[PDB]
Design a protein around this nucleic acid. Structure first.
Ligand SMILES: [Cl-]
Ligand SMILES: [Cl-]
Ligand SMILES: [Cl-]
Ligand SMILES: [Cl-]
Ligand SMILES: [Cl-]
Ligand SMILES: [Cl-]
Ligand SMILES: [Mg+2]
Ligand SMILES: [Mg+2]
Ligand SMILES: [Mg+2]
Ligand SMILES: [Mg+2]
Ligand SMILES: [Mg+2]
Ligand SMILES: [Mg+2]
Ligand SMILES: [Mg+2]
Ligand code: NA
Ligand code: NA
Ligand code: NA
Ligand code: NA
Ligand code: NA
Ligand code: NA
Ligand code: NA
Ligand SMILES: [Sr+2]
Ligand SMILES: [Sr+2]
Ligand SMILES: [Sr+2]
Ligand SMILES: [Sr+2]
Ligand SMILES: [Sr+2]
Ligand SMILES: [Sr+2]
Ligand SMILES: [Sr+2]
Ligand SMILES: [Sr+2]
Ligand SMILES: [Sr+2]
Ligand SMILES: [Sr+2]
Ligand SMILES: [Sr+2]
Lengths: 150, 142, 115
RNA sequence: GGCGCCCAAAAUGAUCGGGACUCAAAUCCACCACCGAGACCUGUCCGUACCACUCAUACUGGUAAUCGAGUAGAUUGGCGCUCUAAUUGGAUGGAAGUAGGGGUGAAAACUCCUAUGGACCGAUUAGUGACGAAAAUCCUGGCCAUAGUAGCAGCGAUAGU
RNA sequence: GAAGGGAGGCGAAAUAGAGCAUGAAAUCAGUUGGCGAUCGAGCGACAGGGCAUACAAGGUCCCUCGACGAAUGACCGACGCGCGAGCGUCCAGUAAGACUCACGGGAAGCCGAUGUUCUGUCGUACGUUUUGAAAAACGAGCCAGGGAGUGUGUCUGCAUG
RNA sequence: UAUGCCAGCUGGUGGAUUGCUCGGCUCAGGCGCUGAUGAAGGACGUGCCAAGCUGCGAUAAGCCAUGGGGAGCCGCACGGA
């Protein structure tokens, strides 16, 4: 698995991390990109909005075939990853929690660092025509979050 | 409060007017990189030089732009070949006894990297006393 | 590339002589000894007998063997002698090594190269 | 006799490379000055061959206008890898390996610094080889783009709310 | 939530926490440097600019002037020719002339070097097949590791003993 | 400045590399038959908990004797009782 790839001063920071989550790695990469810099509180409001279908997540790298979304700004392609989003809400629920237990203002903290890392695929096999069977895997994702005092 | 390198870090060798001339030349002329053809096009192909063997090889046939091919013509001047850029002749050293016979006026010493801190200390002090520069000196805060 | 240290010094000696003294036979013998072994001489007594003359050191740029008869009182200098050649020769003359010949005659005078 | 004109029709967009040029930037007859190679001349260095000295193929000095391109192939010196021996060294005051960086060598390659690592590692000489890879629709393993794409509809059994 | 996460505890080390010594490349996430939405494709070599650079292992580099100064080699001026473009003689093998050095002044991202990018010159891979390969001839997605003159007997040379 | 290119940094993935060897490979010496007194092989059992291996055979990871050995033990296998 991963280790925090960025230094964090304990006296003004709170950590959180997801391990081997089976969800779209490509979505994680996009959601992370998007919420970076936001306030834990803001990020959560945002993700609930995505899940709800009210806010699109810009798909700038893995956008093949994706249709344009008007509410996307400065870009065209976007979607509403509800599964990866619910997983980041979990991450954020952990982060803010820890932050509080330490005496910080969880919600008010700035998402200093958030990044997803594909830890590996879970092997699957799908039977095909002509007597062969091809891969049918699930990506496994770790994601690191660092909350920093404003 | 600050680091100082042990030994005669600034010592220079005394070269004949001719050795100096040729040393300066070597430094002025330089030479091609001489890396393997197309090494930069395929990661699996390393920089180490291999004679271009292809019958149609552009480099092998000497096409201008494809890089120079290794020839004795590129050899550096005899009187200086292998000298440190300072002009000193290098002498590999593994212990104190290796410093014996070394001429600190034209030779400098390079302690093998395997040698430990304890034995370097002895070698470094003994070399300074013999007027010998150590190319890879230990830095201490004094 | 000679491997024998002795043959190697003998050659350096022959040169030193030919160059320093009036030698030439010595430099000529060094020349041949520097060539491959198959070219070196293998001479039996019979030949030394047929072409040697007293008061003229016979110089064999190789090894002297023992076939045939030697009656002449000649001094033969060679890289080596078989145990029998040295014996048959000493009976009527003298067998000496080139290391000695160069020692007494660095000018390489009055000599006859035999092969 | 010189130049030209007619003779003279082809398929995606015409052409002297293009622009464009008419006492020319055309053609012909003379001439003047320039640009332009690794050729030729010149300084230094390298290799090679030969000479002098020499044990030397080690130094040093000398000669080359009459040496310096090369596939197949012949010949020769050298780099690197494993393990053995002899001689001789390094390492917990941090070995090997790996990463980034400095120095040397035409080069094979050698070496140092910093980080990592945490226990082994060399050099010289003589040996020993299951000794060097960019290639074989080469092998095995791992991994990316393909792609959040195709499929998750089609069958007389449309199944749900 | 017997998950996972945060904090904490052990230990020299948990970046030794379970296919748990070391941890390369391909490659992925984040991020730094350089380039970047008017512009052209064997991806570079060589030369020269921009921007970038902790130490260490490299320490040089720029500007006046001066000395030395190979091949080459003048302007101006004077005289004399040519219809003319221009040339000849003298000045003069002079001034100039690459490199190198000395004096004085200067640079510390400063010089080398490394990264990237821009400019100039050359440039349609590599290996193979072939008279001819960028080839609209053949091979490989990428990387690591694996991957081809070996033994016995006999013969025939050769070098060494 | 988006999408992005080249190089590096931090962290992954991966398991090369270096180090290590409980396994191999080869050579040498010794020794050499078993079975109807039912062998070799196999099946199925057998443990407090027991799936695999090993052992054993309804006396079933064993029972007896002699000698050795010795304060420990209950196989591989570091659990609990
Ligand atoms: Cl993915
Ligand atoms: Cl050479
Ligand atoms: Cl004979
Ligand atoms: Cl060589
Ligand atoms: Cl010079
Ligand atoms: Cl062969
Ligand atoms: Mg679509
Ligand atoms: Mg079938
Ligand atoms: Mg490469
Ligand atoms: Mg030795
Ligand atoms: Mg290999
Ligand atoms: Mg598609
Ligand atoms: Mg590990
Ligand atoms: Na939009
Ligand atoms: Na918009
Ligand atoms: Na072929
Ligand atoms: Na080709
Ligand atoms: Na073609
Ligand atoms: Na594939
Ligand atoms: Na037996
Ligand atoms: Sr895309
Ligand atoms: Sr070291
Ligand atoms: Sr040549
Ligand atoms: Sr040649
Ligand atoms: Sr030739
Ligand atoms: Sr091999
Ligand atoms: Sr895939
Ligand atoms: Sr349906
Ligand atoms: Sr159908
Ligand atoms: Sr902890
Ligand atoms: Sr002059």
């Amino acid at each position: 698995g991963i280790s925090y790839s960025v230094e964090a001063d304990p006296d003004t920071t709170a950590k959180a991390m997801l391990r081997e989550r089976q969800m779209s790695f490509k979505h994680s990469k996009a959601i992370a990109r998007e919420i970076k810099g936001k306030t834990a509180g803001e990020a959560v409001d945002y993700l609930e909005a995505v899940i709800e279908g009210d806010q699109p997540v810009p798909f700038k790298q893995h956008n093949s075939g994706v249709g344009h979304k008007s509410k996307v700004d400065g870009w065209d392609a976007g979607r509403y990853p509800e599964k990866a989003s619910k997983a980041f809400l979990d991450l954020l629920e952990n982060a803010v929690g820890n932050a509080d237990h330490q005496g910080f203002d969880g919600e008010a903290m700035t998402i200093k660092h958030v990044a997803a890392h594909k830890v590996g695929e879970q092997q699957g096999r799908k039977p095909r025509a002509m007597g062969r069977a091809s891969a049918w895997n699930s990506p496994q994702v770790d994601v690191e979050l660092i909350l920093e005092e404003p | 409060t600050e680091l100082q390198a042990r030994g005669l870090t600034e010592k220079t060798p005394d070269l004949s007017d001719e050795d100096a001339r040729l040393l300066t030349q070597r430094h002025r002329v330089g030479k091609p990189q001489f890396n393997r053809q197309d090494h930069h096009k395929k990661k699996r192909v390393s920089t180490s030089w291999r004679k271009p063997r292809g019958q149609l090889s552009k480099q092998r046939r000497g096409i201008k732009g494809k890089g120079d091919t290794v020839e004795a013509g590129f050899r550096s001047p005899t009187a200086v070949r292998g000298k440190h850029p300072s002009g000193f002749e290098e002498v590999r050293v593994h212990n104190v006894d290796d410093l014996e016979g070394v001429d600190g006026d034209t030779e400098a010493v390079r302690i093998a990297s395997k040698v430990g801190a304890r034995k370097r200390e002895r070698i470094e002090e003994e070399a300074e006393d013999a007027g010998i520069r150590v190319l890879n000196p230990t830095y201490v805060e004094v | 590339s000679k491997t024998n240290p002795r043959l190697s010094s003998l050659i350096a000696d022959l040169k030193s002589a030919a160059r320093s003294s009036g030698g030439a036979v010595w430099g000529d013998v060094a020349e041949r000894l520097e060539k491959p072994r198959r070219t070196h001489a293998e001479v039996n007594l019979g030949r030394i007998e047929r072409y040697a003359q007293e008061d003229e050191t016979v110089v064999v740029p190789g090894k002297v063997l023992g076939s045939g008869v030697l009656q002449k009182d000649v001094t033969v200098a060679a890289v080596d002698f078989s145990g029998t050649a040295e014996t048959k020769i000493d009976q009527v003359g003298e067998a000496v090594s080139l290391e000695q010949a160069i020692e007494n005659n660095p000018e390489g005078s009055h000599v006859r190269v035999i092969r």
